[model samples]
Target: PVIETVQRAAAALLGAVDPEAHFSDLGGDSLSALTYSNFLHEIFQVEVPVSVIVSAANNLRSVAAHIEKERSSDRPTFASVHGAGATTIRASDLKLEKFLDAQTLAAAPSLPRPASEVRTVLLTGSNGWLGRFLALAWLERLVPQGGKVVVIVRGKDDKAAKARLDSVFESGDPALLAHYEDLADKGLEVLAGDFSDADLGLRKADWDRLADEVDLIVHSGALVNHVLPYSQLFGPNVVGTAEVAKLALTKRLKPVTYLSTVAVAVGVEPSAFEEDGDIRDVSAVRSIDEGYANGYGNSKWAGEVLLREAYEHAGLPVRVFRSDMILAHRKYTGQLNVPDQFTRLILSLLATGIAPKSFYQLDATGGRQRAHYDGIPVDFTAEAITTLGLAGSDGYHSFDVFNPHHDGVGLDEFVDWLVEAGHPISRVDDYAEWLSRFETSLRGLPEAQRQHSVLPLLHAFAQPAPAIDGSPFQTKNFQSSVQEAKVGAEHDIPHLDKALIVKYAEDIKQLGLL
Candidate 1:
């Protein structure tokens, strides 16, 4: 009965979100965390702190313990029920400084750092992997503040633009949309323009008017095909960037941040990729050539050059974050859309018993030795960009956001763990061959095989995994963000463990995914 009561309380909390949401998919923001804790208190009549809720926000067992205590104990202390010496914990009480330095990633003083201040932001490439995250992060920020977003789209039709953007959010799990209020309420406004269309096809008057009006402009639109054709890559990656820069220059109002990829630094020597590391030194750039891995890299490099050159030419202030591969976290559940075609393919295959024989042989492995900026968190990236803009600076700051991640598993180890977790695999046997076979099976599968029952289950495994490295930047960013925003240290995790995974996954299955 205790277990059943806990489940009932969880179900009540889950009722606030979509039935299809995974455990991590439930609202993990500070407010939602508090709300969940409160729901448990009301349902089971137990005592729990808001900090405990946020800290153990994504863990099912920890939450279940709240109810279990209620079922077993006569005393019911609650965080919301405050009195003298209530022993309450708030988000402000968490000691997160040890996680990262705050000076580097400082938030804007005028703007608070909690996820609530993020209202509307202009996102480029509303279709890309990082772009989707930028969009969702912006939406997540607005939930508490009663804000909405405006997207600069490529097409001309206003209605179609709205529909296209709606479809993007609707395709995500139902749970998040419910908590966010409604995907429709996000208040999508389509500025009909294409990066390739020149000035984004915006009239000079409209560009000037909107240049300084929008609260934030997050230029996360870029190609990552690695081997895309020059024409295909430059259309949005290069040409579109010039237009965005032109718009930023016109208003000279807020800070502008561009999403530059680590691919732009491809030629840099190993062990030489530091936050302050020079990109031009011959010793530093032993591998950098006139061009990058392919058109996508070349185009993004061109975009970065444009961002710097435009800032220099106009004497404008700009923030450029050259980030490496961004995976899923608390907000995204690590799902990479069409842009991360390769990584998702690998992850999807691995989730269904497909494993890789060697991590070094993988395409992403080419960047393994490159230092990670503790790889930027999705929330961190969003918060940093928002903070940078809110600071209202016109100067330029270049940051190398590598993957300085200190987490439970790496790509190789994670695959091995998944194979064992997903199906029967011999613990004593060499797992390398098992992964290789899995890779081959995935690659050889017919197009039809791609649509399998296991694909949905694959997402539950989208926990935060290893990023290359980002310690230097994160060291500074952590401190700067907290001090500036006055928020607790932020560590973005999708779900705490399998217990939480089962809780959410079971609910999702009941919603018909099973």
Candidate 2:
């Protein structure tokens, strides 16, 4: 029966031996639901959206019944429906509200402060990867310095907001749990609000309270989805940035620490990306049109532009901090933000047991194709951002908060390490040929089995003109701003070598993701 088949697939995905276990009870998440959906498609030759498997009604029997119901219809195949791959974004395509008035622009003043004192800080995205780490940083670092972190997040109420924070803390490092409990009860204040809403979706009283109490505003919240379109992501990434800027512009004139992405410099010459350069410079705009390959990058580009406009026109006390890819935490592997493009790529590669050698070899040089994977651990990244944001009260503002040393492991080196660590992997010369094989293998799986799979999304992005190019990228002068800010100097940025790769792979395997 479809029920037994679905049960078997679900059990396999969750690494469960139970045939009658509920998906969630067996540790199923949204991505796992996608895997189940892919399995359903494979077993029944039917299409089921990922949302259905993750919805409240989702269970083994219900999903099986749903698949059975849909199997009879003349539904389209996955290939026919999801053929479009990665799409690019141009500078001229973005529309953003001008952030500076004539008066504000004419009499602009630098946002400076004595690098020492911080009393109350307002932050967003405290429930995210960097955000949670930042929250921990605040409790461990800022709170010890006699400061309080007020987090403004979208939720039903304070209770719900605290619940969100609770979830993050519960899944965090065990050593930090005791401290989290104390801090949650006393130090960290949760304010329920939405960044996408007008006045940050807060009551006038709450807004006014923040203005009165907040000494610094660290706007870190954002939608990091690379697969969605610019239009679909405009609200959260673009408008949310704008709304956060508005908060900075309000009564208190709080110094804004804007979290941006290095992808903003995507198409620009690797050497030309300067940390302190004007965001609206011709080269910067040009880079967006030529460099940014996806909506996520484009949206971040737009966000940076708005911040720059605010800095230029209104003299908004703001510093833009751009980060490269943030990796999983060194101490806490659970902190790794899953389903990211990197993780997705790894999963897809494992699924097929093959990867295009060109992926690692950015250049076609005759010798070993070598490229550096530039990623900063979340803890190190959060620590750097926290220090810079706090000390950024004065001095040079903008910084590239990545591994300034360019200590990323070599590409072929990583592949060798993966193979040596007992993971089966094969490298092929042709990326396109390899991708076709991967795509075909994915289609043979069930709907739920592939639901959480990012093969399609990665396929889409990779198909479009070099969606990801890690070859020959250099970060020579990227760290001066970070050095100037004097953050992350003590934190060790580990090389993405055999030890780290093996640990991450084993972690994923433990979760039955590999």
Candidate 3:
């Protein structure tokens, strides 16, 4: 019964099929874990601490054993409870000095002499969406231009790493696959490693080879969890970036393209700033107390700080690329990152058959209202990164990549598109009413389905005011990069238009999500 309850709760949230699946594997974040603990408490009438629930070695099965052990002893009735509020970063909590000191005190490796052209590129995060796109771009475009791509991956062995690299090309265009098959011509090297390691987990010989051979390094791997606290992501975001910077110092002062986000300035009041605006020194960046909406944003801000240090102190060529909310690939029809916050919002609203009234109002007033979507297609972002990186290894630069179309696509248009796509979508006065109804609707459903259907959408719309408050992100440098690359003719970044919305709906439906 305990396992059944746990499975029901987990399945409601994530649709896990395996009885022994880990909660984290099933989209069981800290927030969802709290819900699971609370649910278990109600079912077993015994106190099950959330920490114990999350820390269980065998997931639901362990939780069941714990319940049995607890039932044998007299205990007070427990109710699962959690507070839903923004986690504020206190001034004291800002361990900027320690982070900076750690990076600054690190040994600076020898810099290889300059080369006229970028022959080899060391890339991270190839298994990810953007990383895979970068791989394709290098194979198709850069390889012909005489560039080689080396991907850093975490796997059991060389064969496993190669398999991961191969997996990137599996779902894309056949032409791209053909290019991947012929990857040897341009020399595709896969290094089995991770960012958190001392030298990206490479052996001494492998590290030396990369130092001698690699000309450019693209640091794109990230934990990517928005709900995680800064402390949790600090190792990967800050330390990983520092490690990449260290690698950059090794050979030829390899130009580093560090993937950043527009959300770094989320706390900058009167948040409107140009692409190069709000340039702060390393100290100012470290001293930042607040302005981030979440830990992910905070960590990215710190990443930029560490990269800036790499450039100033270590002589590394660094380029900070700030991307807005990245959507699925435009040309890739069936592929998408599931449980995307934006996608979930659309799905949840559509499921409720009511639109957010604020969205409707934004449309009525030509989007003069505060909130709007600043979604940029993933393909465009990948292209821009490739263009800038391929533009040759230059000095440090920062650019923003996002949909340049004014204010982007509005909510009213998105809803209309969903309706056109045959979804039974309508409009409520605001997210509050819609969320209230949506939550109530999921009450009696199985636990797993309830969590899967409700939590993500709830978080997406829970704080509607902040979601709508920020102005459209600026992208002056990014626009110029696209124009300079002259590939502007080859690919145009799509606005979050009706067609894109329809495509998303179609894909979501195919995923059995809608």
Candidate 4:
């Protein structure tokens, strides 16, 4: 009966009756998956996630088997154990006290008034998207002064680690690649290390040397998987941060610059956002459920908690930057974080060649309301973060690195520009009408286009997007710091504009991401 029903639905949805065919092969995506799940639930109250339905190993029979087995269970089970290692414990249970031992909290470091000069820096995540830019900025500054930047990357050995770092700069951009190669030649020490390890996966001698010589610590590395649970991420994200803090407090008082996330304030109220305050009080606990990126956001919040404790007890000079959406680099030709949602959405719009009149809710008069998308170019993000971090000589500081401008330029406007650029995109007046057409067109897209397109994320467009402004979070500390120091072109956080939005289309095509 289950197979019969499933076969009928598949036939009706995509004109297919191959029960052994994978759901994706039958043109099933998140949008289709949602409807398919709705049907399965209507018959037998069992639910399935898009991940389960789209897994290449799963066919219609496997999905139907899953439904039949889980129909009577309290919660549904997936056909595939993709994230089996993920912990079942809620994020709220990941208290800071459990990780930060009493001995480490009690030991306070004495002040050693150091010079303004920065040399021999310890930077993690040199292989990550934002990490490369940060490494570049630090290199640009440190190389001229005959300073070295020691980066820890996860690998089997130094050669493997060095290869990982090299691959990041191998984007085929000659100018960018050459500049980094030159700077790295002058001053770059690549280490094969694991953050989750007891000694940070370092040799006894190497660990001891870093403790003695490192002048500054920039802890930006983390397991950034959104779907993984807190337990799976705790080791690298929280423990790694703790390891960095330990390194910062050891031997010499090296100022630590931590890269936090805006997701820490996911459930926090804007009014509660203080310019300078305790993160423990602000983001004390976060609940974990099936929501996307729950584990990722919670893990970052834990890093802040650990840093706050380190600052209070050890008097370590700490700088925390909770960055927003790090967008495409302005200077880098055809460089963008391709996996990010913003890039996918842009590519999907161009691929589908249609957009609703507005991506946001209508005003009282039945008109499009102005909304903002708080995103920053990677180039500016690195420069501002570096400048603010270097400026902090003492005390703990956290900056909500986000856009404060109430500029009306947002996703709604982004589409206007994309259409105006003669991208052959059509505007649909009715939101419902557009969504229906969008879903069908997306499902019919070519495999390559559909794979990278927003087809799997169509559930977010069930209705008009919520009207959210750019200046929701408190950006006072970042804005004021930029004003005081004149962080320059890097300091002036650019608002969402036509030029940037239009560039996204060009860059997406240049990379053939669509």
Candidate 5:
């Protein structure tokens, strides 16, 4: 019987795309574990619940063993039609006992920060990805204490504004969930208008009401798309933020928090990217007429300049956060507003399990330079903006956030570790060759269509690896701020893990991304 069971288990794994891999070797997460549990129930007579899986550290082998032990004596239930051996278990009845008690699954209070101190916020691009996170983070801080937020939204109509806000809430986040729970007891408010509109597109009644109510502002909304029309891009990012600065001139708004991008800083070589340098001097125009390689970067550069000028002219309290590509939490699967299509294509390939080891190959001259994207977690921006807003002073605030590379590793090293740990990879030795092939395919494509095209996605597998920057933005207050907030590194912007990448890429391919 033992030999049969072992053989059955081995046979189950042997036919998988990665034949030698176990279910755990599939790089399963909480969600995948749940799916596998259902899979097991369908095949076996015994029940398997998420609680069992969770308790066992999400290991599939342990889950199977436990089930076999529980129902080992049961007779095999099979159908005669195709002679396919069957089991009697069903996913619905996996757990006879209640799996998740509210007490067990209930989240800790999200308002980890004191409420009284967190007031006066300025949210830029109040409808963008980073902005949404900052809004939720501030809401988290305020919910625990008794505080209100002054959200800067564009467009007309309360209905549209709330609808937009609802999308942000529905995008799925632990912090946002906690924030909503807190809202049940306290509440949040929105100030709708345009950023480019003077007094922040605020009407007389709204502006006065907000002036009396809010003390801080978090500016998170911005356009990063290369395709956005110039009118749409500059108006909100450059002129709109400047309009926000005017409100700061009034005593009503205390400190204004803004989110910028590190793309503003160009590099000659892939080297250690540190946030300690003056960015103004570093932003050199590679092309005079174009000014920058992309419009998104150029807009960010102008936005940064506007913030500096606004601070100098108005003495508005300001804190600016700059980051490279931003990543969602290991759990979130959608964007709150418009998606980051470029990053999504890359992440989608990884999520669906078809990503190649090397994404791009470079010539000998560029081969030596490598980087990892420390892609800032949405949570990090959420925390930074909220913390600054809660600080209750108006002065220029600025910092850089991105993935830093200590060596060749960055996210690459993290992935290597996961592969070593058991992630399914078709070929480890051919990573360089794969990347070279991937890069050639990408460079050959028209630049305009490269982002969403499968060529860039597929060509990412061959050659000499370019290091992704995975460095943390060195902040003087990071240590103290983290300690006071009781935030963990894992909770903040987490580095990319190999297991997650493999699992994610596979999922993306299954979704037709490849």
Candidate 6:
């Protein structure tokens, strides 16, 4: 009975009733969590607070254990929990000195004497949405050069690493996979290893071989849980980059093409000068606090700091791409990032059938607001990163990777297109009324729609935010790179008005997510 109750709640929240599924993994919030606790009350005749059931550390088995204990009412409950520790470190606290010792530090960083010939490339994070596409693009790019794309992923058996990489491609366009397979068949090498380990968790033979052959390093792999604290993420995101640095500075001099995030820009500002070359000028400190991906932002910056240190001392060519939002592939089927904030909001608005007249604050006349959403689709982004990564291998450069079109195609424009697409969407006259009613309506959606809705992340729409004009950073450099490299124009960057927004519905139906 207890297990069945858990299944129903799980089914309602995420359509997943697996016993091992996490409460937070399903996107359960306090709104549904209260209902979950009540259902347990009705069945087990015992009360479980929302905190215990909805904690980040909870799964079905743990929730079941809590229920069993609560019914007996024998022992006092302890509020302290493992993994839910308070934020303790500032961004500056994560010093580069912590990762590199004096001896390795004193040695200067270097790149191969020859810059143009990239024979062998080491690609990490091939399992990720962006990483797999990079693999495909690089594989095709390297086919003529007679080089191989060596990839490092977390696994034990080398054969299963192929399976792991294969799975991300399984759901996308058949042509996409076909192209990937063709290139991979010719010159793709796979290695099963952990980045956080000593010597990247690879056999010494493989490690030494990598240093000899690899001409470039693409460090994109990350453990991407937003809720996990900095201490936990420090291992994979921070330490892993340091390990990659060690490899770059080791036997051979290889250019390190690092994937960073716009998250590093938060709370960072140039004191007087505008658009300076060094990130250290603005990136001295980041406040670690409670928010989505706070730890993620911190870890990425920490990695950035070490990479900069390596570049300063060793003269390593470092390219940092700070992406805003990486949208789905324009042509690939089921290529959407289902868990992303944008996708979640789209689903919630569709499932609920109502939104505030303005997602952001209205203009002086209280009419439609003008704002901009900054992002690039994965296809164009993959091409840009690959092209620009190869183009510059001599010195350090940073790209904002922002969609900086001044066209007012913003969130309001998205809803406007949704209406034009014949979806039964409604715009409430008042933002507060719409938000309240939207929350209530979400709780009543059917299992399929409810599980897929934006209910858990309703916090983002709690208040009407002021409209933003354009990219927060100076994107002229990256924009110029896109033009000069002659990539990322597969389609224009935002392209929302040109039919990208309407396609969100079609893609949702393709996945049967609605």
Question: By TM-score, who's the top model here?
Answer: 6
Q: Whole-model lDDT for model 1 versus the true structure?
A: 0.47
Candidate 1 structure quality by residue, lDDT tens digits, 1-514: 5545544555666564322233435545333445655666676665543433333122555455655665675211122112334222121211112111243113212232112233556678765556655666566666457766667664435555555555555435566546434544655556665654445666666566666455557787654554333333545566567667655555333446677766655544445544433222311112222242444555565566555555444554566777665544334332323234333444344334444343333334333322222233454555655555445354666665554444433444434444545533232122355544554555555543443323322332333233443332333443444356653244331212333222223333333322
lDDT of each: 0.47, 0.63, 0.65, 0.76, 0.49, 0.75
In Å, residue 103's CA in model 3 sits off its true spot by 12
TM-score of 1: 0.58
Candidate 4: TM-score?
A: 0.79
Poorly placed runs, candidate 1 (over 4 Å): 1-121, 136-148, 179-187, 203-205, 229-231, 271-293, 331-348, 351-380, 406-408, 424-439, 448-514
Tens digits of per-residue lDDT, candidate 4, 9-52, equal: 87787666777887767777544765776676787765554434
Tens digits of per-residue lDDT for model 5 on 1-514? 4324433543453333222334445444334444555666676755554434433122445555667677755211112111233222112221111211233122211212212444544456555667666666666666666666556554346556656666555543466556555662464666566654455656787776655555666666654554432223544455555555545544343566667776555432324333434344444332212223344555566556555554454455566777666655444544422245435444432333334444434335543235555555565656654654456364555666554435444544544554565554343335555455545555555443343444423433223444444443454344344446655464344455564455444434443444
lDDT of 5 at 412: 45
Model 4 backbone overlap count: 0
lDDT of 2 by residue, 374-479 (tens): 6777767787777767756543356665554444354456666778888888877676777777777767656554654566465444541332324334343445
In candidate 2 the C-alpha lDDT for residue 227 amounts to: 49
Point out the higher-scoring one by TM-score: 4 or 5.
4
Selected candidate, larger TM-score, 2 vs 6: 6
Q: What is the lDDT of residue 243 in candidate 4?
A: 76
Clashes found in each candidate (C-alpha, N, C closer than 3 A): 43, 26, 15, 0, 69, 2
- The C-alpha stretches of model 5 lying farther than 4 A from their native spots are 1-122, 154-156, 171-185, 227-232, 267-293, 331-338, 347-357, 360-371, 392-394, 405-465, 468-494, 498-514
TM-score of each: 0.58, 0.72, 0.74, 0.79, 0.59, 0.80
- lDDT by residue for model 6 (1-514), tens: 6666777876876555677877767767554665777777787886565545654335787788878777776211111211234344343444446665566566544334534688889999888878988888889888877989999876436876777887777774689778778888899988888777677878999999987788899998876645555554666788789889888877656898889887777666623212326766566656567776787888787788778777777888888888888887888877777777788788888877898898888788878778888878888889888888887688888888888887777888889889988998999988899999998998998876775677766776778876876765688777877776666544334444546777778788878888
The whole-model C-alpha lDDT of candidate 2 against the native structure comes to 0.63
Error of 5 at 135 (Å): 1.7
